[PDB]
């Protein structure tokens, strides 16, 4: 059954994405002398992993790799209600296993926060929600525009375009809220490390941005 | 009406470009603890954002996202005079709102200059005009060459080719003049911050570079 193969693809795609991306953000300098946080390091690993994962699993499950976009397809009637509940559950499970494996292989002296997204100390959580609302908006709009069958002028790798959309989101909002733009990516390490601070902005934020982006494209720009 | 949708797309696309790209230029160490400036951070965020915006809005409004290229199409009779004035006004408006949002979500101690393009202290504005004239010339020439219908050897993503043209412009002239190569990108934060020093070189510069690039391609190289 392709339905079970699609769900297992989403679980496995998220598992690789979380494990590889959260590993790159590990600060090997430790707490006694933290090394400067390489910034293009985190952006490319998060960005290119999505491009790699969409290339790998795009034809098997659609390559949502995000609870935010999965909701957008339901809002735009691209997948069924029963379709999304298995995707969201599989995506959340993949992050939990993906981050759980990383905790086992990472030496305790360099684990730190395990890539858990934190809002800046001087930044209000209200502004943190707005940042997530926008960085996910450009991501979902790119995904919808790149995967439009009615278009003709689409050139190049669709997965690469989606990957670079994630990278610029990280190139902007790592110090604001961690540039989550993925509720599953924030749910995983939060479960493992037991850190649950301002976690609602990482679900309400991307979902509102996803629904706004999907509705604008499907019902206003290209109806 | 497709006219209203095209102008709205330009306002929205240009707004996202400012907020994401100017945010990457924020020095989170502040004036009192300046962190070293990451050049690939600024270059890639600016370069890939244009490549993302062209992918998102290329089929809706043409994906100018620049007052300089809009003049170039007029100089080559590719868009109407009435079309350009609404494009330029929307692009100027998008940067003003886009920079205003960034000023709202940035902590006061790290706002700094808000990405406003100053000329280097040891560099004369006369030489600064020449730098802006050239890095915009290579941008407009790439856009005209990438989007030429008569060509048959164009391969890969057109948006990515335009995106990397912007990136190399930033990799060259960030400490020369800030590598504006976009009159709207300089007008937006300047309005918000009220900094108006050598601002004419950021309008006269890119526009003259665009006119030379558009005229040379359309009337000399590939007539």
């Amino acid at each position: 059954q392709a339905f079970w193969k699609a769900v297992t693809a989403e679980f496995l795609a998220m598992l690789i994405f979380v494990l590889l991306s959260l590993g790159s953000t590990i600060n090997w300098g430790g707490t006694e002398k933290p090394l400067p946080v390489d910034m293009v390091l985190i952006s490319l690993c998060f960005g290119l992993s999505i491009a790699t994962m969409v290339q790998c699993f795009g034809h098997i499950s659609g390559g949502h790799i995000n609870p935010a976009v999965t909701v957008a397809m339901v809002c735009t009637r691209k997948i069924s209600i029963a379709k999304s509940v298995f995707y969201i559950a599989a995506q959340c499970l993949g992050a939990i296993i993906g981050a759980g494996i990383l905790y086992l292989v990472t030496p305790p002296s360099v684990v730190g926060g395990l890539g858990v997204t934190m809002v800046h100390g001087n930044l209000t959580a209200g502004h943190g929600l707005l940042v997530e609302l926008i960085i996910t908006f450009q991501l979902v709009f790119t995904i919808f525009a790149s995967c439009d069958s009615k278009r003709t002028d689409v050139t190049g790798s669709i997965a690469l375009a989606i990957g670079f959309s994630v990278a610029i989101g990280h190139l902007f909002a790592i110090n604001y809220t961690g540039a989550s733009m993925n509720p599953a990516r924030s749910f995983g390490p939060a479960v493992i490390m037991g850190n649950w601070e301002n976690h609602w902005i990482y679900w309400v934020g991307p979902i509102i941005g996803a629904v706004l982006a999907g509705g604008l494209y499907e019902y206003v720009f290209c109806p | 009406q497709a006219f209203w949708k095209a102008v709205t797309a330009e306002f929205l696309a240009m707004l996202i470009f400012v907020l994401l790209s100017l945010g990457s230029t924020i020095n989170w160490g502040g004036t009192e603890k300046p962190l070293p400036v990451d050049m690939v951070l600024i270059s890639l965020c600016f370069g890939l954002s244009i490549a993302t915006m062209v992918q998102c809005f290329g089929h809706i409004s043409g994906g100018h996202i620049n007052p300089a290229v809009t003049v170039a199409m007029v100089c080559t009779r590719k868009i109407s005079i009435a079309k350009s004035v609404f494009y330029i006004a929307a692009q100027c408006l998008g940067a003003i709102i886009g920079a205003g949002i960034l000023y709202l979500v940035t902590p006061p101690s790290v706002v700094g200059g808000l990405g406003v393009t100053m000329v280097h202290g040891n560099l004369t504005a006369g030489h600064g005009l020449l730098v802006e004239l050239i890095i915009t010339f290579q941008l407009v020439f790439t856009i005209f060459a990438s989007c030429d219908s008569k060509r048959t050897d164009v391969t890969g993503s057109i948006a990515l080719a335009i995106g990397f043209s912007v990136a190399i412009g930033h990799l060259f002239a960030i400490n020369y003049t800030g590598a504006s190569m976009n009159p709207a990108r300089s007008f937006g934060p300047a309005v918000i911050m009220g900094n108006w020093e050598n601002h004419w070189i950021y309008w006269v510069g890119p526009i003259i570079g665009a006119v030379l690039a558009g005229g040379l391609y359309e009337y000399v190289f590939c007539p």
Epitope: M118, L123 | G30
Partner: antibody, heavy 116, light 108 residues
């Protein structure tokens, strides 16, 4: 136009508890980190505690750990410092100062005397 | 922690003289240093941040230098207002620590 006003000082029995306030106005209180600095009579300055703009991150000096708790309320733009288990050494003049790294704006100072 | 020691403890000078005080850090803190001026019964006033930058509103006669562990604050032309107590502050890493304080006194 930026000023900080302190309150809550004065005499206090040893081993008690105290609440120090620092009312702030003229600047965006939410977006700036707040600090507590004391100066014992005849001695130098001693940094005590730090709090982020949203209160998410708080740090304390080695001698200020446990006994002192710093919290801020951005609704009324007031900074509080819970001083518990006061000792005879803990007497000093306390200043509230803003600044993540370097303090530029200081209050007038509140004198706390711990004496039976 | 990082212990910051000042030298001399107290120095004497006349109006118009040039004096320098030194702040010594236990470990390297590069250009993360701050200087303050405090008069009796008054809050400290910030003079220098980044160990070489002058805070706005401060006269240019104050000059700071040094990096790593050796820092020197120098006053070019002494003034009657300049007689106060000067502290060196560390902000490379938490906890932030001040110096032991150096007092400037009139010479007679």
């Amino acid at each position: 136009q930026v000023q900080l006003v302190e309150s809550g000082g004065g005499l206090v029995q040893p081993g008690g508890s105290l609440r120090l306030s620092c009312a702030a106005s003229g600047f965006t209180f939410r977006g700036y980190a707040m600090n507590w600095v004391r100066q014992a009579p005849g001695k130098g300055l001693e940094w005590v505690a730090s709090i982020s703009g949203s209160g998410s991150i708080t740090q304390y000096a080695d001698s200020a750990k446990g006994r002192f708790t710093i919290t801020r309320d951005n609704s009324k733009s007031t900074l509080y410092a819970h001083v518990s288990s006061l000792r005879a050494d803990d007497t000093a003049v306390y200043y509230c100062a803003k600044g993540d790294y370097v303090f530029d704006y200081w209050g007038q100072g509140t004198l706390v005397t711990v004496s039976s | 922690d990082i212990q910051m020691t000042q030298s001399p403890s107290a120095l004497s000078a006349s109006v118009g003289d040039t004096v320098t005080i030194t702040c010594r850090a236990s470990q390297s803190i590069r250009s993360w240093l701050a200087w303050y001026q405090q008069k009796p019964g008054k809050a400290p006033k910030l003079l220098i941040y980044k160990a070489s930058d002058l805070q706005s509103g401060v006269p240019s006669r104050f000059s700071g230098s040094g990096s790593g562990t050796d820092f020197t604050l120098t006053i070019s032309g002494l003034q009657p207002d300049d007689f106060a107590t000067y502290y060196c502050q560390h902000y490379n890493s938490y906890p932030y620590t001040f110096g032991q304080g150096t007092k400037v006194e009139i010479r007679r």
